[PDB]
Design a binder for this molecule. Sequence first.
Ligand code: 4CH
Ligand code: 4CH
Ligand code: SF4
Ligand code: SF4
Ligand code: SF4
Ligand code: SF4
Lengths: 443, 419
Amino acid sequence: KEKNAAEIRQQFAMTAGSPIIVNDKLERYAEVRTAFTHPTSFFKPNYKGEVKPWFLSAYDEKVRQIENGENGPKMKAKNVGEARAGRALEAAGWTLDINYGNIYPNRFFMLWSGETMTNTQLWAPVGLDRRPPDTTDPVELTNYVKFAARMAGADLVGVARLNRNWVYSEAVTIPADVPYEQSLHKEIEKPIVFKDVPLPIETDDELIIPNTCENVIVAGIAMNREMMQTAPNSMACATTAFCYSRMCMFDMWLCQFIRYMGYYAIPSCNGVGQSVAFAVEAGLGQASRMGACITPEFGPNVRLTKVFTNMPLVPDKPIDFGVTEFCETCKKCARECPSKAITEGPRTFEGRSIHNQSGKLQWQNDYNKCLGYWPESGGYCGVCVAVCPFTKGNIWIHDGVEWLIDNTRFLNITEVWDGKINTYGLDADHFRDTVSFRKDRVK
Amino acid sequence: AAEIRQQFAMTAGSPIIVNDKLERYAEVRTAFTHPTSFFKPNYKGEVKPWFLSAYDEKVRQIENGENGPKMKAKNVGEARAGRALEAAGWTLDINYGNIYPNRFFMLWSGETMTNTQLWAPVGLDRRPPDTTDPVELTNYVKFAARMAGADLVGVARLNRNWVYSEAVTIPADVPYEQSLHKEIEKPIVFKDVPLPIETDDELIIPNTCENVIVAGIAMNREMMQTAPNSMACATTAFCYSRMCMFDMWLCQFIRYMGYYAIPSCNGVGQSVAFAVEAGLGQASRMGACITPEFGPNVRLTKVFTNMPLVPDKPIDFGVTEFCETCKKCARECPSKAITEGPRTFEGRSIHNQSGKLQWQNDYNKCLGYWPESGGYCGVCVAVCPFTKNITEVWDGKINTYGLDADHFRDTVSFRKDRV
Ligand SMILES: Oc1ccc(Cl)cc1
Ligand SMILES: Oc1ccc(Cl)cc1
Ligand code: SF4
Ligand code: SF4
Ligand code: SF4
Ligand code: SF4
């Protein structure tokens, strides 16, 4: 029986309701606390023992590896030139992304209004962004916006009511008068608040999200299987990097579509809020031991972005295809983790350290150990994504009645350069899994 | 499809036949920019810049619940959605085509880019090439091209005949909001310089700039087949932003490999000529490069570089003789812009480059239909055999970037087909 992603998602759809279990310890999380930004984790030694901002220490190891003809830690490349090309590809992938993740809200690519964008100015005479909506039916809007999402480069798209618990209490950002070359040295915190205002707006003191901002649209941006399996080496960094620029194009494309439909839209990429939680509530997949959203189509080998809007939409249903029960007995990522950051124990409500948000049932991982391995290996690792059985494209079987997971799955870089590739690193042998008709965009 | 292309490979050599009259072409001559063709009346009779008259028609259609010229939409909401999708698709494109060289997204050096600054400590762009082998480099840069969103990619030696003699651009310090009012003409010249450079007077391409990399960027068949209505505009627009992201992605990669790279999108030179010389496809009667995978329903962009590379072979799979007897685009063209006669060396008007053997088309008649229809037409692309209502499109099949899984296997690539 030919693999049917729409059948699979229908079979495992849940009934409405956020699936994330929480208790009263839960409060919104200040984005400064992520290991990338918090002062307790931000500094790491390089290979000479010099303590630097982690990404500068990682740079030192990238340079070292190229000079020694390596594609990763102790991993010899075919020659220096191949070591060079992998890092060149990686660096180029980030072309449309600011400071590793586009996290500063209402700066650069992440503008909360379209009014200053070159494309909005060019189209101003048509007035699409000033004309009131001609569609208010959530059903038709869900079909329109999901079609646009797919055009905008999403391999998966889902809708959920916006749960403010996952919105950062305060954002990391920079002052509006600071130019790019100073951005890394002038980062600040700024509260994200919800107020009774008509449009998203930023004051000197606050990022203000309107109380009418009802919905969140979550996009899955698929990474390349062959490149990710080279984790923690350079080609895994490259597919990661290219997908961040894909995320950026997505947010901007979709926000402009939403505005031109007569609503407002907030982009985010890696900022504003926690993408895994939004993705779970929008039904893209389930939370996992490693901490990522695992999807039926790609496993965890998919990046996430999201857009916030007041456009009426029909929320999608959450999905339960057994990931919690497989993670409970699998532990492959925990055992392969080069830094031992992923726990082998049970889910709790108690954060392991400042980097976890306490008050939600989840596997609690030590994300400072994880970041610690990035300067050491000179990349973004990804070994956990690479070894997860759900990242295999072969995991689904049909028994003549229904779909199930094959339990048997839970029991070099020259060839990547020389081997299969296709547009955006997508795989034509699986590209049918994300074909979409109206019946699977809205019900 | 990888076997079809080698089956139809020609011997080396540009397949574009020229005579002793051919001269490089001033970009200002195109119908989009030339003063003889730039102004067009709107439906009220008011004479305006053509795209502004076209705006007026889009507004009138939305108010009247139309997806195109006297093409009724399901309702006003649907009419609004098509135009909203078209407008959004242009987000990463400056003034319809990114033609101004070394401006906005089309920077001829990576040095001021945020990505380059962030990565400056690694020094990939300052470091001499570690690979000078054109065979390895051709495999690397084509892999990168596919990552960067190209559905097709080819290499050719740079034929300077198809580089514009003078570019349309703006002065460097002019803010975006004045750009449309302050466009100027600027010579593109080749000189013995290390790097691509712009002075007050000239865009200077180095004489070392040996090669051009041509990308094909596939458009959605269902959407294009609504030409000349709004969904054909939307797939046109979205692919222009894909072109821009391709140019920047690939230029950055080529720069981080130790070479220089010039983006262009719709600027700098004539895409169709470059695509034929790079083996992507064959010139056609409508004027487009017809490819075996997509026919003409594919956009083009290109990057120029001194990176050593193995040129591809031009391809002959019978387009010229098929166009010789087909004439379907000529008969369907709403403006009678496409000729039904033979190919000549003599342009029909100022918008053609004379001196090369091609079907000569009147591109001002084409442009005139765009304000009238409120779109970018595309009927020729839609009806062309090689290429094979709006509610059903909005309700029907779609996939990432508007690509089609029933055909996506045809652009799978391995090293054997890359070099
Ligand atoms: O998710 C991320 C964020 C930063 C970096 Cl360098 C890599 C991946
Ligand atoms: O090729 C082009 C150029 C400009 C426009 Cl408006 C549409 C298509
Ligand atoms: S490797 Fe196993 S335990 Fe880890 S996320 Fe994947 S399925 Fe869950
Ligand atoms: S990215 Fe690497 S270090 Fe981090 S949790 Fe995954 S396997 Fe461990
Ligand atoms: S775009 Fe339309 S008007 Fe122009 S040549 Fe093609 S069919 Fe004719
Ligand atoms: S419609 Fe016919 S004549 Fe026109 S370009 Fe296509 S094949 Fe050639």
